[PDB]
Structure 1
Amino acid sequence: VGSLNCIVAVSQNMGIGKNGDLPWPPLRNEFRYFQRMTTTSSVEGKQNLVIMGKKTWFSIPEKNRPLKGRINLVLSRELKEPPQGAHFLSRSLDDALKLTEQPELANKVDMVWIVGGSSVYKEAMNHPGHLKLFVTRIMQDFESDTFFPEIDLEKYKLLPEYPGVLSDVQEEKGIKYKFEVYEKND
């Protein structure tokens, strides 16, 4: 199994969600970035795997769910089986990672991408090991009820550029944003 990564789009006030939806209007190219980055495997014959909390799974509309071309794993301790359209269910992040290291999966999965939500991000971010965070900075304040956890810059280094990630400012629907990549190893 390959690298463990988080990916998120966050507003200036650290908002990632409002009532199971994005705090900001749909940004199509931002969605395209998300899709490209999470689905693109660097190894031929392998897929990436996406890990998300239950509420994140259900915040994806049925039309966009499961995230195609990726293995979809949902975290929940209430659920007894994976949601309709999902592939796997784990009761903890460690369990989900262990699952990827099984003989079944270890030969199939390249990159593991945590796609939300807050508690999943926090858990992964505060867990020793090699980890990258792919962060879209939405450069406006948007009313939110779910927030990205603090990035500890003592351990997460902002990378000066990264392949396949544009380094300049983007704009959609009058909203400016930029792509960042952070990396720790502890």
Structure 2
Amino acid sequence: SLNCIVAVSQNMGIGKNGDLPWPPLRNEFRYFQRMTTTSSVEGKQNLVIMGKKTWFSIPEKNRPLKGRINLVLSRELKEPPQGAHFLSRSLDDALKLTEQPELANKVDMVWIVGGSSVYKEAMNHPGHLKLFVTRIMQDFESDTFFPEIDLEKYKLLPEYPGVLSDVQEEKGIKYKFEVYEKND
């Protein structure tokens, strides 16, 4: 199974000029950290998979993302960028790696953390998928977008354990946490 996690504006934007479209929302980052870091299985870590631009968009003080194995996708790089644990040239290759002995006993959950083309590839996964979507309830000028969610294929869950249902607000920006699950 794969999990994708994203924060999206009302106009489906995720990024602008290599940064977020909105000012930083600390508590949104805290939600992302909690969901991507937490494993129920003692000793294991979750794997975060991200594109190269997403990696370099994270402040160096937060790289690698603490408590998670960090894998970057790139076809141009020849080794992981400084601080990253792994580099793959495709999502299928990254998932192949999670099955091989160097990672198979270390990794619990797999989280896809952006950007656009990585989400798009993940959404063609034949196995089970969940989409953890933070709805940023404003329009923001964006140049990178999340793809459309097919509501004949996914369902919006009424709630999810450990995920707050209530509207959040930081810096005058309202947002909320949703979880979608691929149909059987």
Same fold (TM over 0.5): yes
Maintained 8 Å contact 1:128/1:185: no
Counterparts of 1:12 and 1:41 in 2: how far apart (Å)? 30
Maintained 8 Å contact 1:129/1:185: no
TM-score, normalised relative to structure 1: 0.97
Runs of 4+ in structure 1 displaced over 4 angstroms?
none
* Structure 2 residue ranges without an equivalent (≥5): none
Q: How many angstroms does 1:185 deviate by?
A: 4.7
Q: What's 1:116 paired with? A: 114
Counterparts of 1:158 and 1:43 in 2: how far apart (Å)? 27
TM-score, normalised relative to structure 2: 0.98
Q: How many angstroms does 1:126 deviate by?
A: 2.3
Maintained 8 Å contact 2:155/2:183: no
Counterparts of 2:155 and 2:104 in 1: how far apart (Å)? 28
Counterparts of 1:8 and 1:88 in 2: how far apart (Å)? 21
Deviations 1:77-101 (A, max 9, x none): 1110000000000010000001001
Q: How many angstroms does 1:104 deviate by?
A: 2.0
> Which of 16, 19, 26 is residue 18 of structure 1 equivalent to?
16
Maintained 8 Å contact 2:13/2:142: yes
Please say which of residues 31-40 and 124-133 is displaced more in the overlay. 124-133
Counterparts of 1:149 and 1:14 in 2: how far apart (Å)? 8
Q: What's 1:185 paired with? A: 183
Deviations 1:10-51 (A, max 9, x none): 000000000110100111100000001100011111100000
Q: How many angstroms does 1:6 deviate by?
A: 0.4
Q: What's 2:4 paired with? A: 6
Counterparts of 2:82 and 2:183 in 1: how far apart (Å)? 36
* Structure 1 residue ranges without an equivalent (≥5): none
Question: What secondary structure does 1:116 align onto?
Answer: coil
Q: How many angstroms does 1:127 deviate by?
A: 2.5
Task: Report the aligned-residue RMSD.
Answer: 0.9
Question: What secondary structure does 2:113 align onto?
Answer: strand
Maintained 8 Å contact 1:133/1:183: yes
Maintained 8 Å contact 2:136/2:174: yes
- Percent of residue pairs identical: 100
